[PDB]
Amino acid sequence: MFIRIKCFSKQPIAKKVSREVSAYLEYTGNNTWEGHISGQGVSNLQTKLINVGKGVKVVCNYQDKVLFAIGNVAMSDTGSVPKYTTKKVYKPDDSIFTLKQGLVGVAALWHDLGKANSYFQRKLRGECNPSDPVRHEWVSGVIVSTFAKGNDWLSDDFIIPEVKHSDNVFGDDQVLNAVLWLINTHHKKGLVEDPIYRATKTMFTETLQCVNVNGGWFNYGDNIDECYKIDTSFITDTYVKQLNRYRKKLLATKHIWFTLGEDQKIAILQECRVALMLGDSNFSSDLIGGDGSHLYANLDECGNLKQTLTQHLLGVTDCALKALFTINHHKPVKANFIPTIAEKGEGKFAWQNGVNMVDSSIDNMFCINMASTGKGKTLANLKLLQHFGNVRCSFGLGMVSLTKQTAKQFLDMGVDYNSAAMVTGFSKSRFNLGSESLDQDEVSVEYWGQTSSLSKVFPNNNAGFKNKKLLSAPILVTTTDHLVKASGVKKGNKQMLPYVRCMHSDLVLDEIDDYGIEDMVVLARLVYLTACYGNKVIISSATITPAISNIFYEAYSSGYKVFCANKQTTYKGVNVVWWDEFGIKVEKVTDQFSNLNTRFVNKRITNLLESTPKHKALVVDQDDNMEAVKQSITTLHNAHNSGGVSFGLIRTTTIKDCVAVTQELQNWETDLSIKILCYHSRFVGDTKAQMEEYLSKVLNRKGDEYKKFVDTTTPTAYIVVATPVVEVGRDFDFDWAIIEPSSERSIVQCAGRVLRHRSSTPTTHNIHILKYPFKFYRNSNICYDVAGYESKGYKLKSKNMLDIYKKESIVNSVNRLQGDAAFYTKSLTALEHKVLLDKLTTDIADTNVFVGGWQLTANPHEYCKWRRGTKNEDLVLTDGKWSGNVTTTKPIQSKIWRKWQGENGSITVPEYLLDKTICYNDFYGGYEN
Amino acid sequence: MQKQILTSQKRNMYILSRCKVLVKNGQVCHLHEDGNVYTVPYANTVFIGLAEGTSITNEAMSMLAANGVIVFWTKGGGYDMFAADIICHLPQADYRPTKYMQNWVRLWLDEEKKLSAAKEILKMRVDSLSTHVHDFGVDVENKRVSSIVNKFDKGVTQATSFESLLGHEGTFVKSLYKEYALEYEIEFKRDHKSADNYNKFLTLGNYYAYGIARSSLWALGIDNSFPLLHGSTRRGGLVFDVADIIKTSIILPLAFHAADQGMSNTEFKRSCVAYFDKNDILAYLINNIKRLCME
Amino acid sequence: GNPNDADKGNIQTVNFANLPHNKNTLLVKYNVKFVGDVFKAELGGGEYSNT
Amino acid sequence: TKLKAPAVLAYSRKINPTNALMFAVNWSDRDNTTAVMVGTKTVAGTQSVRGNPNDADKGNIQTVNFANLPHNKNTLLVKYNVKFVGDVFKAELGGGEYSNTLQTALENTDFGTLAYRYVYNIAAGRTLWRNRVGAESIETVITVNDQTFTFSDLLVNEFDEDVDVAEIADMVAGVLSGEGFVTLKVEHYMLLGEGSEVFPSQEFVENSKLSKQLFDLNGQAAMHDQKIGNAIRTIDTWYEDATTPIAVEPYGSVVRNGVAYRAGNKTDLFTLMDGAVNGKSLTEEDQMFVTANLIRGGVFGG
Amino acid sequence: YNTISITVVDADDVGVNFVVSKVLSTLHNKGIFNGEVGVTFPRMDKNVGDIITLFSKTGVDRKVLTSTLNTLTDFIHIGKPKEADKVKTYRKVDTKSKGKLIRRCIKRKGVSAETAESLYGNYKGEKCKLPYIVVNSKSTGQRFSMFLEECENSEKFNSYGLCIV
DNA sequence: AGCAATTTAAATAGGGAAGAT
DNA sequence: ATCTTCCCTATTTAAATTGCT
Lengths: 929, 295, 51, 302, 165
Ligand SMILES: [Mn+2]
Ligand SMILES: [Mn+2]
Known about the structure:
This is part of a larger assembly, with one copy of chain A (929 residues), one copy of chain B (295 residues), two copies of chain C and one copy of chain E (165 residues). Chain B is of the alpha/beta class and 295 residues long. Helix content of chain B is 50%, strand content 9%. One manganese (II) ion is lined by residues 111-112, 280, 284, 312, 316 of chain A. It is classed as rna binding protein/dna/rna.
């Protein structure tokens, strides 16, 4: 590897980086180094070139592509290294940036006018309840609305009038309404409980007129008259001139505001709100010290009076203005040019040369990567990102362990921690034992990286470790919940960090089908927000349903419409890149996405069907599923075994179902040597982690290394009874599976856990589908709702899987890829597709995906909750002693193959099952006994 | 303190001539006798060498050794036929991996095991020829080179004494050196005290292969003071076996090509860097001693 | 099993029986009564028992 | 392989000491043994408990025991018989799929050293915890199979070489390695001084109850048999970071220090016996520790 | 003032503080603290500590006190005599509980028992929580607990090593 | 002997103004 | 408008000296 590093730094920092860059490369003179170094040499050079201080101006070239660029060095757009750099380059009709500046400046000088009431003064001094009857943002909104109703609010002297209690402060003037919504929602968004309003309201002001004081601001309301008697000590020199210059700025630019569309207004006001909380939290974090008394805004850690309200408003204004400037004029730090990506894929990765069919100069890209598992999907996503140049992306993945797997792939192929940042925000205690030096695994949290210039506008220089890893990451391999808060939050400033993260970075969401329906709705909201700033969305899901692919394209198309009309460019359409392991297709799609997507789906189906059938599923006829499991285990051991040893996966639905199947199979008298494992999610930290590592090392069938992790000498049935934790994110390879039916994507995923690593075709049948789910004996009205898309609004007419599924069927992604809306009441696949198009629709609703008008409100974050689960309290095992109503029990010790013990950790119990003892056990975790 | 760069992937490579080697402002550099200060990339240097009129200091040697750069001094040869004595500072403050030295000792003390290792290392130069084929000079797979390496392999297979190995060593060196001489149409005699460019390019490559061999041996902690091939003529240490594994494959055709094209010594330095870097000859030698040690 | 409760006391009461320290011999008194009619079943049948 | 330990696996106690009866003698009048009586003085004081604030006004007439030497005898005499028994490898509740493997894995145990340290803890005064403190003269007489042994100056912390302890250790190791039993009548004579207060063992009282019960057999002060059994097996100097001999426990755990020395660092007895029945090479010290536990006994099941 | 160290070692079988108290008793009974040798403890946080420190002005040698503590030599350690310009001197503080002062009211004021209960019924009952030692007293035949706390340095000391007045 | 702090000063870059075509 | 020349303008590099280890 031959690199060349050029440096244009000033001051003695130029000399301090010369020591390190002259420790690793030869000096060619004139502050230019050039030579041969290794991969990790480049890394050590990155780590000790960035850590040496601020102001490092380093460009590295590997062959002729830029390896890395330290700082905001413009470096290369076409040629490299400029000369007479200077200012005043373009100076356009910027319009919408002047609009955002005027809105943020006018609102930020009015965002805390409502702290001047006597209640907030005695709240800061501390002789009343610290919770206000009406929040000060609403009081400042009442001030601004009363001033606007009285005088002309855009060109007049200010003077705060006598204000009363107003239920609504939103009128008709679109720009005033924007300023009012920025003022009122600078801490939290208003929440609308009204069902008719949630049913009908769509527009900007027409929804904003329904935002009343009862949506969170009106806490208790007994001291309203003191909350609206206000002093007017803000009339000073610099506050009045700042208010005048920003109001006239808005006055001069609001003529382009009425030429915007609804989508524009929503996205622009979201940006304005994010910059306003950025400036407000930035000025509230630091201590300024000086004060002019008689009025105060915030309190220090000692509770003393600080940050008087005139200079507080001025500081929040300038900090929000500077926030806006750096978030709207940033050339963000991108990743290194990974040299182990750009070469050609060989063999089964040979489809990854589809990036040589995509244009490298497209400003936008919507990848739908429909490639099957085991083909290197995430490596292909990184290849697609690097085809357009240097990489800046957020790999948002479900589960901690899948982020760990993608991080380990990124580490061992070409990516160091100067470009990658693995973020899992829980600090799990799963450590690697055996040998610390001989590990060559366990990707960790260090991020030598490079701190971006956006950290100076965040509160108190961003944060410590976690938010520095969030914001400053070129490549952010993260759990997805660090990105879905970009679309907005209920309370606080947790929106700004993923918002500013997704503003300048691409978004790569892998296996989006494993998320929930509301989770997929907020993920497509994130896709729309990412496309709002021209970034590229890579979706990587093999079993995509047309509905999902369509609504994600429509979210990207609305976002790219926002980005196109935001830079005053005519919208040519979205560069959609359909991708699988058999080919690629790049089309400029502005309309008719459905026929092209279904034609690519049909081409992928015909490229999947002439291949040999790997998963032949038979739906059993035996009604009782207990003895159906027994007979199917006996049949698939007598048919599918490797010299007497067979691996079976009993995929069931819920935990007590799993322990019921386990306790039946343990007490089942047979000549077969059944060896039973329980693989559900309710387990203690230690025990769970141990199951994972063992299962990953015994079900690895790409080699014969497993022969030494199990007793393959004696003919044995190694059976793993598992819940849907096996069908998501597990690289497992079973000889056969017996599936309790809950949804068709569960069938396809548990087909993907059988012969995942081998290529031998089954002869007779490798999957035995149960006749009924076990909830049929508990609830015959609805049985597929647990881990399925059946529900109270979408009920199957019959629950028989002979009626709702094929008796003999080759299970692949084809049934999920096709998409059928008719006959959803008597087939599982059409039931699935129905729900997917009836929840992820092209409407705005309130919990929908095109959400417009409601982004202003708190409604999409309350009624569409990301990871909406049950109450979930956590019973914690502390050194062998349980906390709550747990009561350790003893398992049946009949056929347990492996049982790992646990002493620490915690189990997640729903509040429903907290009533009784969860009865934790070493073999199977939680049950009802 | 990080992984400190592994030795087999270290890339830079110098022999410094007529310059006092010092440290300015953090980095190791060398200052010639005209005021020119050229920096040494000590974190990626494999070895440095010191010719006549050179002088290194203490903290420069420390920054080379603690980073792990083996340093030798080129002069010291005073006999008529032999490269006599090269003085070589080992970085022993870095505590080395141990069991590779134990394996080398368990093969060194057993006489039949040393002979067995002597056998495989004599055909290691034969496979070096086969793997590292240059674009210029001779072709390795011609009838003459294959006939002589076949006679060499047949003779070293039936060998039973180290003096027979020394004799067959002499016929091998005479055979290759003279065949290269024939190809480049010159008369060649290997004298280290000769003004002919085919000779002092060969001594420069002797110093280069010496530095490569001590970096390969020090990367596995192997001392020069365990020569598995020994004799009256062959008394230099283990460096005169792991250095001349790669004469007739790497250095000697490169030395003959450099003495045929006939620019200065610096193109030969840079060509040695280029071929030791492109084919990873250092990592190749380390991996070969790796498959030697555990067998 | 778990070694992390090797700390703190086990502290419980048990029953004990020692000889007093003035006598050094333990005497055990019992009466063993061997009884006849061993082949008759006390409550079983009368064919299988006599065979 | 993978010889999994039985859940019922237990071993009997092989060092059985009697209760250490305590008498008052003189230093030169060693035959006149008068029994040390536990006196008991009453103390008037109101009760103070966390659960009953209403009962703190009146009650709790407590009567705390004590035990001193009489004011005419200056030497405390402690008599107990330590019974070492053989076949320490026989499990009483275990069986012989695991215990027989233990027999054939701990046959190379040097019982000589094990027994030495047992008889040295017998003789040096490890069985005399708080009443060897401050004694100007320590003496131990061991009577074993009509043989009398005299010990005067043995420092209890290190197991130094003396041929007297060694002599007894021979027959003790011959018992412990083979079959049978041996009985050591141990009488300790410590000259504390005229009327010095002596230290019997303590019965467990409740958080309330009385202040302190001293151990009584038929009115006379004594010390617990298991407490002496703690003294005899206090031979463990083979754990990592071994400073002082601790009592040989299956986890190397001392309660009074709040730490366990062999727990959680792969040197606990259970991992070593599973290593023995799976046949990895043990050193001499941990194998001696395992044999000392089997001499101590206890149920090892899970 | 030069000083010497007496550190209790290997006292796990017996509490450390019991050995500390026996060191105090054996230092009392065989002289040592005539009127000028005093004690101090470097580690009183909640325990009395395991180091006795003697800061006699004339100078304490190793030989006299090692002959004195011949009875504690199994679990004692004596450091060489070092010097210290300032030692942190402790004194004796005693507790009274009901009947104590009642008998005082018998023998000083000459009042009857019931009126002596009457003047002291709602009073007294102090509780010392200071770090302490447990001392055998030989002249008065009962064993008690003696409490030590920090006070200003006094020229004269008792027979125990604590400050006078 | 290398370096560090710290001064001292020479020079490099850029912006504004004015004069040419 | 474009481009050049020149004057600020101070920002930015290189040398120089010298205790300190
Ligand atoms: Mn506020
Ligand atoms: Mn504020």
